[PDB]
Structures are given as structure tokens and as C-alpha cells.
From a paper:
This domain is present in many proteins and regulates critical cellular pathways by recognizing polyproline-rich motifs (PRMs; Kurochkina & Guha, 2013). This work explores the role of the hinge-loop composition by interchanging residues in the RT and n-Src loops between two SH3 domains: one being the c-Src SH3 domain, where 3D-DS has been described, and the other being the Abl SH3 domain, where 3D-DS has not been described to date.
Interestingly, both domain-swapped structures differ from those previously obtained for the WT c-Src SH3 domain. In the WT protein, a salt bridge between Arg95 and Glu115 stabilizes the dimer. This salt bridge is not present in the Src_Abl-RT (Arg95Ser) and Src_Abl-2 (Arg95Ser and Glu115His) chimeras, where these residues are replaced. In addition to the salt bridges, hydrogen-bond interactions may facilitate the formation of the dimer. Besides, in Src_Abl-2 the Abl residues introduced in the n-Src loop form a new 310-helix that results in the shortening of the n-Src loop length and the formation of several hydrogen bonds between the two chains mediated by water molecules. As shown in Fig. 8(a), the two chimeras that form an intertwined dimer exhibit the highest B factor in the distal loop.
Author numbering:
A (entry chain A): 82 to 140
B (entry chain B): 82 to 141
Amino acid sequence: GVTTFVALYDYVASGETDLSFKKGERLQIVGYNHGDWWLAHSLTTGQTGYIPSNYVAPS
Amino acid sequence: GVTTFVALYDYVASGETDLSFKKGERLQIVGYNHGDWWLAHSLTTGQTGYIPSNYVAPSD
């Protein structure tokens, strides 16, 4: 599989974290138009966090 | 479109945030086997944050 990606655009973190939730809780998805997200690790900065899928390309 | 979802399993937050990055930075995707994530808002608790896609189903 592809292990490394390149950022195609700048992205500034909003500070949002993941959300704890209980089975049976009702949730609304926000910002669907921006697409899905993945957890990633920066080789360049060493930090880890969520990134938008459509901001990266295989490298 | 579907505006509300129901959680099928419990999920406990890890505390990870989103990541700032510059165009041209190289990144490695972690935990691909867990699938993709969405931003969501809890109707029951009022909080917002990332959730795993395969933990929710469309709901009324």
C-alpha cells in the first residue's frame, strides 16, 4: 500500500478533537461537503492528527 | 441527504486533534485499517468532533 503522501494545499488546524459517544446516541455529520478525514503523521514536523483526504496525493 | 445518524458501538476519544500542514509536506496515514472519519455533532451531549465512519448508521 501507499505509505507516504504529499500535501497539495495548506491546511490550518481548527483544534477539533475526536468525539466520545455511547452506542445509541444520535449524531449529525458536519461539513460533509469537505469530505472525509484520516489520521496522519507528519514526517516534516513530527506531529500527528486528522487531515482532509482531498488535500493529499500519493508520494 | 441523511442528517442524523445513530452510534452502533461505543467510542472513546483519544484526544487527537486535526493537524496543520504546509503544501509539500510529506505525511503518513496512520491506522488506515480503522477507516475514514467525519466531523460530527452530538444531539445528546452537544459536543462536536471526529468520529469513525463505520461506527454509525443512518437514523430517523
